[PDB]
Design a protein around this motif. Structure first.
Motif, mmCIF file in Angstrom:
data_model
loop_
_atom_site.group_PDB
_atom_site.id
_atom_site.type_symbol
_atom_site.label_atom_id
_atom_site.label_comp_id
_atom_site.label_asym_id
_atom_site.label_seq_id
_atom_site.Cartn_x
_atom_site.Cartn_y
_atom_site.Cartn_z
ATOM 1 N N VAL A 19 0.843 -1.215 0.000
ATOM 2 C CA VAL A 19 0.000 0.000 0.000
ATOM 3 C C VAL A 19 0.873 1.258 0.000
ATOM 4 C CG1 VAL A 19 -2.038 1.240 0.938
ATOM 5 C CG2 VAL A 19 -1.921 -1.270 1.102
ATOM 6 N N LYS A 20 0.653 2.124 -0.986
ATOM 7 C CA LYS A 20 1.432 3.336 -1.154
ATOM 8 C C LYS A 20 1.075 4.458 -0.208
ATOM 9 C CE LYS A 20 -0.732 4.609 -5.622
ATOM 10 N NZ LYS A 20 -0.646 4.274 -7.076
ATOM 11 N N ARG A 21 2.083 5.269 0.131
ATOM 12 C CA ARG A 21 1.865 6.438 0.973
ATOM 13 C C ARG A 21 1.997 7.731 0.149
ATOM 14 N NH1 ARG A 21 2.742 7.767 5.121
ATOM 15 N NH2 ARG A 21 1.345 6.763 6.633
ATOM 16 N N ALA A 22 1.279 8.781 0.582
ATOM 17 C CA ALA A 22 1.289 10.111 -0.020
ATOM 18 C C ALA A 22 1.751 11.118 1.000
ATOM 19 C CB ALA A 22 -0.104 10.496 -0.493
ATOM 20 N N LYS A 23 2.611 12.060 0.584
ATOM 21 C CA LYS A 23 2.990 13.094 1.528
ATOM 22 C C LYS A 23 1.804 14.036 1.670
ATOM 23 C CE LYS A 23 7.214 15.619 2.262
ATOM 24 N NZ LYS A 23 7.844 16.087 3.534
ATOM 25 N N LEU A 24 1.576 14.433 2.899
ATOM 26 C CA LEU A 24 0.470 15.293 3.228
ATOM 27 C C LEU A 24 0.985 16.704 3.403
ATOM 28 C CD1 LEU A 24 -2.514 14.956 3.873
ATOM 29 C CD2 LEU A 24 -1.839 14.778 6.269
ATOM 30 N N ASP A 25 0.355 17.669 2.726
ATOM 31 C CA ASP A 25 0.748 19.075 2.802
ATOM 32 C C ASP A 25 -0.158 19.903 3.711
ATOM 33 O OD1 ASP A 25 0.025 21.937 1.391
ATOM 34 O OD2 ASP A 25 2.203 21.657 1.292
ATOM 35 N N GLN A 26 0.395 20.364 4.845
ATOM 36 C CA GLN A 26 -0.376 21.275 5.684
ATOM 37 C C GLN A 26 -0.237 22.660 5.083
ATOM 38 O OE1 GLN A 26 0.405 21.042 9.894
ATOM 39 N NE2 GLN A 26 2.418 20.080 9.709
ATOM 40 N N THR A 27 -1.272 23.016 4.281
ATOM 41 C CA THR A 27 -1.477 24.246 3.498
ATOM 42 C C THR A 27 -0.673 25.435 4.029
ATOM 43 O OG1 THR A 27 -3.739 23.364 3.266
ATOM 44 C CG2 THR A 27 -3.303 25.531 2.259
ATOM 45 N N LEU A 74 -2.382 5.616 1.793
ATOM 46 C CA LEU A 74 -2.357 5.981 3.207
ATOM 47 C C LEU A 74 -1.828 7.388 3.358
ATOM 48 C CD1 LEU A 74 -0.954 2.624 4.354
ATOM 49 C CD2 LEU A 74 -3.102 3.469 5.219
ATOM 50 N N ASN A 119 -5.525 20.068 5.314
ATOM 51 C CA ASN A 119 -4.478 19.270 4.684
ATOM 52 C C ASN A 119 -4.784 18.957 3.257
ATOM 53 O OD1 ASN A 119 -2.458 18.748 6.881
ATOM 54 N ND2 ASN A 119 -4.326 17.969 7.857
ATOM 55 N N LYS A 120 -3.760 19.042 2.406
ATOM 56 C CA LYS A 120 -3.860 18.827 0.980
ATOM 57 C C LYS A 120 -2.959 17.647 0.622
ATOM 58 C CE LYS A 120 -3.961 22.671 -2.544
ATOM 59 N NZ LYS A 120 -5.085 23.388 -1.859
#
Lengths: 19, 154
Positions: free
Chosen positions: A1-9, B60, B69-70
């Motif tokens: 399962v792949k992960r995505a970086k999350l951007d706190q705007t 995930l 969050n984006k």
């Protein structure tokens, strides 16, 4: 399962980001 | 409800059927979360081979901070092997859902218009479908959002 970086705007570059 | 969905932008629309799905998901989060959020993309579309909805991809979302969050969900496209060979299903559906601790709390449903790229191919549709010639158009401006009341942290 792949992960995505999350951007706190609010904190870093967005329109100016290279990623 | 801790994680609230704000908006979704379908970034590559329209697209080749065979193109990966590119969603820019923006949600708000009110408490820090102990775990990961799980986004799932499901393909839904009329077929004779009984069918059990196609799960296109899962992703995930790392340690979830508080605030807005984006992120980008780059989902894999549907396999040609799991779509009608004899007919182009003009109107299909994609379900974008999110889970926390193994329970879905949000589902977003979109209608997708599918047609051939060629002017003549649209008029004289081949006996067997040309997957590499289909162009999808997600009706992104008009989604259906569903909330499920779930157990968050403890």
């Amino acid at each position: 399962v792949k992960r995505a970086k999350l951007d706190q705007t609010s904190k870093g570059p967005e329109n100016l980001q290279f990623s | 409800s801790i994680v609230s969905l704000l908006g979704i932008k379908v970034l590559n629309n329209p697209a080749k059927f065979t193109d990966p799905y590119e969603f820019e998901i923006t949600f708000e989060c009110l408490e820090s979360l102990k775990h990961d959020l799980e986004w799932k993309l499901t393909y839904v579309g009329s077929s004779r081979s009984l069918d059990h909805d196609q799960e296109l991809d899962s992703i995930l979302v790392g340690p979830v901070p508080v605030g807005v969050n984006k992120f980008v969900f780059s989902a894999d496209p549907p396999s040609a092997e799991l779509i009608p060979a004899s007919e182009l299903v003009s109107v299909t559906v994609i379900l974008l859902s999110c889970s926390y601790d193994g329970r879905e709390f949000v589902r977003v449903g979109y209608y997708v218009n599918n047609e051939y790229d060629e002017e003549e191919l649209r008029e004289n549709p081949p006996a067997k479908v040309q997957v590499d010639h289909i162009v999808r158009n997600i009706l992104a401006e008009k989604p259906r959002v569903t909330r499920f009341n779930i157990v968050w942290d403890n």
